[PDB]
Design a protein around this ligand. Sequence first.
Ligand code: ATP
Ligand code: ADP
Ligand code: ADP
Ligand code: MG
Ligand code: MG
Ligand code: MG
Lengths: 399, 372, 151, 387
Amino acid sequence: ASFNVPIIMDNGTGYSKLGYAGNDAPSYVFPTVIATRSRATEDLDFFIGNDALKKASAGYSLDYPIRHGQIENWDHMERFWQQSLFKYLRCEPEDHYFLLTEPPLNPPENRENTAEIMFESFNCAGLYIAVQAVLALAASWTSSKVTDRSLTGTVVDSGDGVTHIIPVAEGYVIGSSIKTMPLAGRDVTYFVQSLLRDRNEPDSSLKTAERIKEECCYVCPDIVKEFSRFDREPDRYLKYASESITGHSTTIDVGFERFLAPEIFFNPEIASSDFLTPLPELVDNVVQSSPIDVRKGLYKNIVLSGGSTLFKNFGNRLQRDLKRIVDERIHRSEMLSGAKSGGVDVNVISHKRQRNAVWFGGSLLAQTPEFGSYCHTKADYEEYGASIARRYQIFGNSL
Amino acid sequence: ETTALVCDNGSGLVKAGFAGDDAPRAVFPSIVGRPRHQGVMVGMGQKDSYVGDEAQSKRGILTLKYPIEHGIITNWDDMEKIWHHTFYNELRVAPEEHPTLLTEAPLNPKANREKMTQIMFETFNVPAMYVAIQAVLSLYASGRTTGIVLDSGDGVTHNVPIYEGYALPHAIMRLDLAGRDLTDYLMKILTERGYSFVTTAEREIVRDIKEKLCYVALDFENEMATAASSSSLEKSYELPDGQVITIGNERFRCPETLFQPSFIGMESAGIHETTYNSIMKCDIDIRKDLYANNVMSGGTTMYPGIADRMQKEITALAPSTMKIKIIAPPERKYSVWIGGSILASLSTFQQMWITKQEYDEAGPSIVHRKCF
Amino acid sequence: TFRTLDVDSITEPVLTEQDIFPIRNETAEQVQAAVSQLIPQARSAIQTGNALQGLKTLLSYVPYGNDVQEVRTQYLNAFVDVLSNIRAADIPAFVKECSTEEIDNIVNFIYRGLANPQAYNSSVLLNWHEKVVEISGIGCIVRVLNSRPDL
Amino acid sequence: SAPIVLDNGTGFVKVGYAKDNFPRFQFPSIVGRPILRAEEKTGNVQIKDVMVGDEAEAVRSLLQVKYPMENGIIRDFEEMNQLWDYTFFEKLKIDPRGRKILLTEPPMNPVANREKMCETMFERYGFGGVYVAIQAVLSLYAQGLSSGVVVDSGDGVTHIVPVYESVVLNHLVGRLDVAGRDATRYLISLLLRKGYAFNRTADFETVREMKEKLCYVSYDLELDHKLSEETTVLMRNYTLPDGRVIKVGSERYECPECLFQPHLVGSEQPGLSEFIFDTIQAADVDIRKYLYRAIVLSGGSSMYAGLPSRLEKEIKQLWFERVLHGDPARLPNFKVKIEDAPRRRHAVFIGGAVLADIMAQNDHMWVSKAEWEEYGVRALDKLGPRT
Ligand SMILES: Nc1ncnc2c1ncn2[C@@H]1O[C@H](COP(=O)(O)OP(=O)(O)OP(=O)(O)O)[C@@H](O)[C@H]1O
Ligand SMILES: Nc1ncnc2c1ncn2[C@@H]1O[C@H](COP(=O)(O)OP(=O)(O)O)[C@@H](O)[C@H]1O
Ligand SMILES: Nc1ncnc2c1ncn2[C@@H]1O[C@H](COP(=O)(O)OP(=O)(O)O)[C@@H](O)[C@H]1O
Ligand SMILES: [Mg+2]
Ligand SMILES: [Mg+2]
Ligand SMILES: [Mg+2]
């Protein structure tokens, strides 16, 4: 009959955003970290989220279950889920439907483990797994009343651990064009920490680097001209107040990091040699590998997602670079042939729900009545075994 | 009876509309598109298979495949799906009330006609229906009764000479060269310029290119010699991507296959020689008159300049004492539909329908004792 | 679609078990009668407290085949009863006083008896297996691995 | 003395003379520009301005590699000129003016590529003869057969051509745009599944060697999915030339699957067996046995382990499903024989070497320098009027 409201899980690399379907905001947005020791037994002395963060030097050792989007240790993940459900979310698993999300390009083994943990340790009524993106496309359109859905575009989901560029055409996701760069907010955070390290600042805590990004960093057109402007202009030399634990008024003199950090996205050579293709060029390759007829739709609508795309002038620079490259190719074809053309425009789109677009899209999707039919029912799991969700569907064709 | 329905299930396009009118109510490609991506977008009600104009709109991801092969239907499931789409989307009338009319290629394996009438009576409950060759409809389109119809479309082409009153079945010639073969050969010769089209949507793009930038050369060797200086035969096209395509002698090389079938490695005579042989098979009492009237119909025959070369070559074959004229209606694409509508509008046609009452006791084979 | 519907099973007929092992020349009625004659002698020998002689007599002939299931089951039941009706202390003498082929039959049938424990007593079969493997060796089990499937 | 033969394949270059049996020299078609990255860069001997060929593939650690040929056509031509210079000047170190060269080319290439390649060969070298032949006819020559359909799968593009009794059916030549390079790219993606990333340039050759050594073609899809789903026997350990070991599982049988299921790499074109079946079926009814009876594999990309058996089984199965419509009565009345000669990788070279002295001693069969210069590009029609 009348089911209970579905629950929208979200397990990012850095932040986990729980909540409910139909809500206008996540109930909890807290870091995906669990505190753990090494007369309560050592089975239960664990804290998660902000409680874990505050209780850091009291006798616990923090650990991040998720890195690069893929879960390595399983005890931490299962304990995180149980603590969330039975402490903050406050729901009984057997009388609700869950909508889990996890980044694409994950091993089927991880999905199998997630499904078996959910249907054995908790055994909820139903579990549905969606791709971090999709939800981004769903939340892209604001005034979604009956008709105005784009349903065709590109979602550049850049987050804490890994970034994904996924094209969508008429709803379906083209697998062959999926490409992923293994650099995100965490790598540039390590870069910022190293930049604080080389200048021998009085405080170089990672939280200080995060806050330095939070209120300092911005994107710049080019690096040499920005260096010249910084040399000439002296009011771009800020001193962030740290107040780490007891160092009152220990101001940290920030410097070139403010423009050197965001440039990793448009110049990935700085982070590491594991990747070397700049983000606009990689997006161009993704769009070109797509079928010819949907290229106009892919270029017309580009949707940003994740918390790492909130940099000022990020979208402007990305749009400028992509537009320049596509103009270069079109003009090359024109002088090769000798005829004018109307060209193709590019509109990188940012909206009011950039930070938690994935969660908002999941919440909007779960409210549809047809969503219930798509979930994995518990009877199906108990009949077909624990490998009911191993056939990876969005990227690539099985068999 | 309220109205009548005419549905010319062509190989490439379907022209379905009410009778008694000159403008088709709905014309659209006969394509059934099924997506090739398991990554379902949850929500917003996307359906398993796409037909009609939605297939053309979403061809970026579907796998377009026609359900008719050289005039012979081979995927009856998608055929009935297309008919469903027509009747309850583009006509919005139940088939239980309005009788229909169908078109069939001559010399078609009659298992096709039998299964067609059987499936219509079964799953559509039409009060009555009839099947007629496109040639007689084409002849009726111009209001005359003499001439030989050159009906070339997407699947096959055929010539049926006819005098006042009765036709000449022994002189009916049919060739499989048509618009689909033209598009295939154009795709084959486009790769010689470096432009590669492989997917079905690319086939549709090349078909649009053939629609917009193709013509028939008056003299093949003369135009090939003219192609020495790339001045006038060179044109440009704008791809949906935003690309620019440069086209040369392939503009007129691909329509030439209608007259030189050996270009695509098909042993046969060009359509001009086929028409000449078909008319020569007729007796002396009839060709003296049939030379003058030559009805040209179908989508393929819409090429600019094809009529002039047809005329010059047919007079080249025919004796010099003959006067030959080629009929070139400016509405040749829908000519078969207009002929069918005119035939249905006549009040002298209600007598030889195929009603369910006579069908029940006669079975599906009645279609052969009634139509022809 | 066309990926399924395998055809390799019909175009090349694979070798079937009768092509590997010699066919049974005896008829079904003949072997059935032979077993029906041998079994009551074994039961009577069990009754008179001479289980060793009963097992020796029952071991002289051994049936096999894919059409003799029922009579083979009766033979196996009789063999299991005969073996379970033997004192344990006298086993080594019996094992040492046998030929290799007789021991092969013994180990084969006790091992088949091990396959159905819902109706048999596994302890005596395991004890006999332990003692025969200890005395004769591993070649008996090798012969079991390389015996006919119908045995 | 003897005429020279050149087979400028997309991923490899082979060269030799007439009457030869095995290629005299084979080396990747790569061009190496110097580059310094986060490596140790030992100064082994020296780094020259442009390093190509065996030296390039050996010193590949310190240089970036660009492939002049992609999809069977030359993308950038200056690098390819450097390649001919290398091959003629140090691989064979014999560069006379006036000798006879027999080139090779896949069937449906653009006219401009072949025309300007011939123009370069004439003007920049001054050779007195030229002839460009399809790889398929050379593959046919390799086994000496006359009638039958031959399939050539290489690094760049896979093509098939049916020939019946010394007559090439030019209107039924095949062109499947999936080859070894697409398989290598899919292998890189499938390794990116697990976490290994190969974004450098030498890593491309590394994973190419990995697919060379480990990957194999499946014979039964469901059986191999069961094996990779329940058993760990399929796991192999491969150590990179850098010295690092990775784990490879289902990737072994999933890499070359793209040849038979091109939708894995986002290709609408039909698979290898389906395309072969369509090509054979489109022919005339008379030659259909000899098309089926003699199918010859050729090219490097056909060296996949277990490929001939899968091809034969799949073609028989598809014939059963498409013609008999499920009736198994007439299945034993079908004769198909896929040829699997050990040197089907160098069949193109062998055919070129044979044709070198088949048509030698008579210059009036091919194009000469004077004829070229006085009849322009249009002179290149004596070779063949293919479609
Ligand atoms: N045993 C093998 N297993 C798997 N792949 C192989 C094997 N042997 C060769 N290959 C593949 O074959 C390719 C070499 O093919 P080759 O260079 O002969 O074709 P090509 O001449 O470049 O083709 P084209 O003439 O179309 O350019 C290599 O890229 C390699 O990946
Ligand atoms: N205002 C901001 N500007 C730039 N980066 C930010 C900002 N806020 C957060 N970030 C970083 O971007 C990451 C992306 O946020 P979120 O999507 O919640 O993480 P995840 O990718 O783990 O799901 C954050 O974890 C953080 O490291
Ligand atoms: N303006 C045009 N010029 C040239 N060819 C055309 C034109 N319009 C349509 N065609 C060709 O005609 C074909 C459609 O023929 P059609 O009348 O539908 O025949 P049928 O009804 O038997 O399918 C198309 O495949 C197309 O290639
Ligand atoms: Mg994330
Ligand atoms: Mg028609
Ligand atoms: Mg080759």
